[PDB]
């Protein structure tokens, strides 16, 4: 019986460390990859938006 | 050719307009979408991170 309790602590603490790591790392990987990716998407969209604004001004002159 | 050009030019404009309209709605999509993309997973991810710790009692 008390071995059940020990097994529970063994899995919970192995899980705790796996989880402190997975909780943090899954977010740091997904989250930093996401902002890095979307920081670039945001910049590329802003660049394209500026280019289209310029393109629209050029057509207006045409 | 004049009519085909007007139609093609009109379509060049409409298709390019659709391209810049979609590039914009896509950017405006994706950009707002990445916000969701970056915060829905980070909020839920940090919620789950926190859960490992929230449940450490």
């Amino acid at each position: 019986f008390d071995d059940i309790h020990r097994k529970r602590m063994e899995k919970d603490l192995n899980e705790l460390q796996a989880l402190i790591e997975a909780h943090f790392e899954n977010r740091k990987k997904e989250e930093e990859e996401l902002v890095s990716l979307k920081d670039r998407i945001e910049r590329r969209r802003a660049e394209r938006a500026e280019q289209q604004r310029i393109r629209n001004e050029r057509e207006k002159e045409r | 050719l004049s009519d085909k050009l007007k139609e093609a030019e009109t379509r060049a404009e409409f298709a390019e307009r659709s391209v810049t309209k979609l590039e914009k709605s896509i950017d405006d999509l994706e950009d707002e979408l990445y916000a969701q993309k970056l915060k829905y997973k980070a909020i839920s991810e940090e919620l789950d991170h926190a859960l490992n710790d929230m449940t450490s009692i």
């Binding site: 309790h5 529970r8 919970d12 899980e15 989880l19 | 859960l51 490992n52 449940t55 009692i57």
Partner: peptide, 29 residues
């Protein structure tokens, strides 16, 4: 809360069993 679902079962069962033991330990007289 998977951690809770199982910890919940563990503690409810362990406290209920411990309580059942507390109650019997005295109740047996």
């Amino acid at each position: 809360m998977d951690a809770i679902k199982k910890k919940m079962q563990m503690l409810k069962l362990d406290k209920e069993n411990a309580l059942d033991r507390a109650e019997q330990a005295e109740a047996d007289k």
